[PDB]
Design an enzyme around this catalytic site. Structure first.
Site, PDB file in Angstrom:
ATOM      1  N   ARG A 118       0.541  -1.401   0.259  1.00  0.00           N
ATOM      2  CA  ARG A 118      -0.042  -0.297   0.103  1.00  0.00           C
ATOM      3  C   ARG A 118       1.014   1.648   0.013  1.00  0.00           C
ATOM      4  NH1 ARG A 118      -3.464   2.295   2.445  1.00  0.00           N
ATOM      5  NH2 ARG A 118      -4.868   2.683   0.896  1.00  0.00           N
TER       6      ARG A 118
ATOM      7  N   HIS B 298       8.446   0.647   3.602  1.00  0.00           N
ATOM      8  CA  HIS B 298       8.015  -0.557   4.850  1.00  0.00           C
ATOM      9  C   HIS B 298       8.813  -1.896   4.514  1.00  0.00           C
ATOM     10  CE1 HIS B 298       3.619  -0.142   3.810  1.00  0.00           C
ATOM     11  NE2 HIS B 298       4.064  -0.147   2.216  1.00  0.00           N
TER      12      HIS B 298
ATOM     13  N   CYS C  50       7.965  -1.351   9.149  1.00  0.00           N
ATOM     14  CA  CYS C  50       7.928  -2.381   9.620  1.00  0.00           C
ATOM     15  C   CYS C  50       8.795  -3.519  10.467  1.00  0.00           C
ATOM     16  CB  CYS C  50       6.406  -3.807   8.610  1.00  0.00           C
ATOM     17  SG  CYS C  50       4.935  -1.896   8.707  1.00  0.00           S
TER      18      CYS C  50
END
Lengths: 165, 245
Positions: B38, B97, B147
Site C-alpha cells: 500500500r 515498508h 515494519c
C-alpha cells in the site's frame, strides 16, 4: 451483509474445477525436488493471484479511505454471486497454503518461491483477506479477539487512521 | 558538567567542520501494483521534516524518492564511495515498508519500489572500514522507519599503530522492535518520525543522540491502542552530540 460475510456458507466451498486444480498442484509440489520443476506451478499461482487481485478491484469498492469512517461496498451492477465467486478463489489460496505447510513439515525454511506468493506483505489487500479467511476456517485465531465480527473479504484492512509502514 | 563533557576527546565525537557530512534520505512512498504494498501516504511529511532537520544540523541532505531495490543499493554505494576526509559524520534515513528476515548480524529489511527487500544487514555493511575507509573512526548513523514484522502488539496494563575494529561506530536506530509493525497516520505521518523531529527540536542542543532516542522510545511507547517500541543497535565508542549554530 451484501459487501461481506461473517461465517462461510455452502456457496463458499470449492467447485469441482477448483478442487481438481488444487489436487494437481498439491501432488506436483510435494513430489517435485528442484526449483526448475516448480516453474510450471509458480506461473499458475502468480497468474491466479494477479487474476484474483483484478477480480477484487472489479467486484469491490472502498469508500472514504484514510479515515475512521471507512466502509466496504460492492461496485455498481455487481451481485452477491460475484462476491461468493471471489471468496471461492480466496478459499482456494487458503486451502492450498494449508497443504503446502503440511508438505513443509521437515525443512521449514527452504525459501520457496511458490510459498512466498501465499505469504503476502502485512500491509497488502490479500493479507487482510487471507488472515480473515484463516479466522473463519480454523476457528477464531485468537490474535487479539474482541466483540467485533470478522469480514471474510476484509475490505477495510489497513485503510484508515492507523496503517503499516 | 553540561558544556564541559561536549568538548572531550575521550568521551564524545568531534564535529568541528561545516558541514558534518552527507545525509542520504531514501523515501519509498509509491510502490508497484505487482507487489501489493500500500502507498505510504504521509511519508512525504516525514521526509521533509527530516530534510529540514538534518539541514539544521549542518548536513549535506539529499532526498531520493521511490527507489527500486537495485537503485537503493547504487544510491548507498555511491554515498560510501565519496571522500569523507573533510567530513566528521554520516547519516542514512530510510522510509519504506519492511519485513522480518533470516538475519546474521542485524535484524530487519526494507522494501524497494519494485517490492523486493534490501536487508538492514547489507545496508550497514556498505559503510564498514573495509568498503568505506574514509569514514574510519567516524559515526555512521542509520534511521530505519519500517515494519519489523507482521505481528501487531496489544501490550500490557500499567498503572499511571592504532587499534580500531572494522565494524566500529555503527548506530542503527529501529522504529519498531524486530518482528512488530511500525504505525503511521496518513495525514500526520509516522509515529517514529513525528516523535523524532519533535524531540530533536527541543533537546538537540543539550543532549546527545542516545539520550534523544530514549525520549523517542518513551514518547512512542505510550501511543495508541496498538503499541510500538523503538530502539537502536548501538556500536558507538563515544557520545554523539549534534552540532547546531
Amino acid at each position: 451483509t451484501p459487501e461481506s460475510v461473517s461465517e462461510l456458507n455452502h456457496n463458499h466451498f470449492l467447485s469441482p474445477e477448483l478442487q481438481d486444480k488444487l489436487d494437481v498442484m498439491v501432488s506436483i509440489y510435494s513430489c517435485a525436488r528442484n526449483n526448475n520443476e516448480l516453474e510450471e506451478i509458480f506461473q499458475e499461482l502468480s497468474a491466479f493471484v494477479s487474476g484474483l487481485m483484478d477480480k477484487r478491484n472489479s467486484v469491490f469498492e472502498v469508500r472514504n479511505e484514510n479515515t475512521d469512517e471507512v466502509v466496504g461496498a460492492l461496485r455498481a451492477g455487481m451481485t452477491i454471486e460475484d462476491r461468493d465467486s471471489y471468496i471461492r478463489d480466496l478459499f482456494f489460496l487458503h486451502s492450498l497454503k494449508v497443504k503446502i505447510e503440511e508438505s513443509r513439515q521437515g525443512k521449514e525454511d527452504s525459501k520457496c518461491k511458490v510459498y512466498n506468493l501465499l505469504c503476502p506483505h502485512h500491509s497488502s489487500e490479500l493479507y487482510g483477506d487471507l488472515r480473515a479467511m484463516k479466522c473463519l476456517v480454523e476457528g477464531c485465531s485468537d490474535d487479539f479477539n474482541p466483540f467485533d465480527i470478522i469480514r471474510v473479504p476484509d475490505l477495510t484492512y489497513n485503510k484508515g487512521s492507523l496503517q503499516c509502514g | 558538567a553540561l558544556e564541559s563533557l561536549r568538548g572531550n576527546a575521550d568521551l564524545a565525537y568531534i564535529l568541528s567542520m561545516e558541514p558534518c557530512g552527507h545525509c542520504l534520505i531514501i523515501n519509498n512512498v509509491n510502490f508497484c501494483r505487482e507487489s501489493g504494498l500500500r502507498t505510504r501516504t504521509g511519508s512525504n511529511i516525514d521526509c521533509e521534516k527530516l530534510r529540514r532537520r538534518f539541514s539544521s544540523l549542518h548536513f549535506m541532505v539529499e532526498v531520493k524518492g521511490d527507489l527500486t531495490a537495485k537503485k537503493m543499493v547504487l544510491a548507498l554505494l555511491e554515498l560510501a564511495r565519496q571522500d569523507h576526509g573533510a567530513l566528521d559524520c554520516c547519516v542514512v534515513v530510510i522510509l519504506s515498508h519492511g519485513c522480518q528476515a533470516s538475519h546474521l548480524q542485524f535484524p530487519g529489511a526494507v522494501y524497494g519500489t519494485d517490492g523486493c527487500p534490501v536487508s538492514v544487514e547489507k545496508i550497514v555493511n556498505i559503510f564498514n572500514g573495509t568498503s568505506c575507509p574514509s569514514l574510519g573512526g567516524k559515526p555512521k548513523l542509520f534511521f530505519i522507519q519500517a515494519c519489523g514484522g507482521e505481528q501487531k502488539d496489544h501490550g500490557f496494563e500499567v498503572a499511571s599503530i592504532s587499534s580500531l575494529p572494522t565494524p566500529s561506530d555503527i548506530f542503527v536506530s529501529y522504529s519498531t522492535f524486530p518482528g512488530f509493525v511500525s504505525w503511521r497516520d496518513p495525514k500526520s505521518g509516522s509515529w517514529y518520525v513525528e516523535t523524532l523531529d519533535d524531540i530533536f527540536e527541543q533537546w538537540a542542543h543539550s543532549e546527545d543522540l542516545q539520550s534523544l532516542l530514549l525520549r523517542v522510545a518513551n514518547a512512542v511507547s505510550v501511543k495508541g491502542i496498538y503499541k510500538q517500541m523503538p530502539g537502536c543497535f548501538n556500536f558507538l565508542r563515544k557520545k554523539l552530540f549534534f552540532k547546531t549554530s
